[PDB]
Amino acid sequence: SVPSQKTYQGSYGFRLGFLSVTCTYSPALNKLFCQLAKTCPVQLWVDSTPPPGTRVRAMAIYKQSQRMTEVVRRCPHHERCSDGLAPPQHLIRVEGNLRAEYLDDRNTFRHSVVVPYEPPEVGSDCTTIHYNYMCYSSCGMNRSPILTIITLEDSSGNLLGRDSFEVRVCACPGRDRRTEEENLR
Ligand SMILES: [Zn+2]
């Protein structure tokens, strides 16, 4: 099957916000450009605070319809390049969170990383999670565009909110964003 990518703010008004160049986001393209394994700050914005026990899941899928049913995973080379937490096959790793869970779906084999939802920190109206992408789009992905889907869920896995963004992991993010944005125009 294919995970839904439909935007859903839900009851809590959930949506994402974003911040040489290691990571840069294009609102026009709803696309994040980042370097391999570097810190990617993704902000969680809500209108009302979800309950304790709420969880935040990140999962990658292929954007192109002809490859949507495929599981996004690291190429063989990058499975060997680690924190000893993220399974080597996982594309998305969370940095700086002691409670990251790395999961593999029983039936779909899709990977995801989950962390507990935390209310915004002082000096901020949002919660920031630091993600790292462990394989280049050109590797595996082999130049195919991927989407990262972030879902806000309750403790039993029920959907509370969903948002998503395209991602390109590349050596020169700033330059590639510029290229794709200029092309858009
Ligand atoms: Zn790779």
Cα 135 to ligand 1 centroid, rounded to whole Å: 4
User: Among residues 83, 94, 72, which one has the least CA distance to residue 140?
Assistant: 72
Do 125 and 45 touch, CB atoms closer than 8 A? yes
Question: Which residue range is the domain that position 49 belongs to?
Answer: 1-185
Domain of 98, CATH number, reads: 2.60.40.720
Cα 1 to ligand 1 centroid, rounded to whole Å: 24
CA dist 175 and 21 (Å) reads 9
**Sequence-ordered list of residues with C-beta below 8 angstroms from that of 61, at least 6 positions apart, any chain:** 2, 3, 5, 68, 72, 110, 146, 147, 149
Cα 74 to ligand 1 centroid, rounded to whole Å: 5
SS3 category, 109: coil
For residue 77, say whether it is annotated as part of any ligand binding site. no
Cα 54 to ligand 1 centroid, rounded to whole Å: 32
For residue 126, say whether it is annotated as part of any ligand binding site. no
Do 171 and 135 touch, CB atoms closer than 8 A? no
For residue 172, say whether it is annotated as part of any ligand binding site. no
Indicate the DSSP class of residue 95. E
CA dist 61 and 59 (Å) reads 7
The encoded tokens of residue 34 equal 């980042």
Cα 83 to ligand 1 centroid, rounded to whole Å: 17
Residue the block writes with tokens 């599981």? 71
Cα 51 to ligand 1 centroid, rounded to whole Å: 37
For residue 139, say whether it is annotated as part of any ligand binding site. yes
Measured at the alpha carbon of residue 111, what is the angle toward residues 69 and 93, in degrees to the nearest 5?
130
Cα 177 to ligand 1 centroid, rounded to whole Å: 20
- 77-109 in b/e form (b: 16+ CB < 10 A) is ebbeeeeeebeebbbbbbbebeebebeeeeeee
CA dist 143 and 115 (Å) reads 29
Looking at the 3D structure of the chain, how many domains does it have?
1
DSSP 33-72: EE-TT--EEEEEE-SSPPPTT-EEEEEEEESSGGGTTSPP
**In the beta sheet, which residues pair with residue 60?**
148
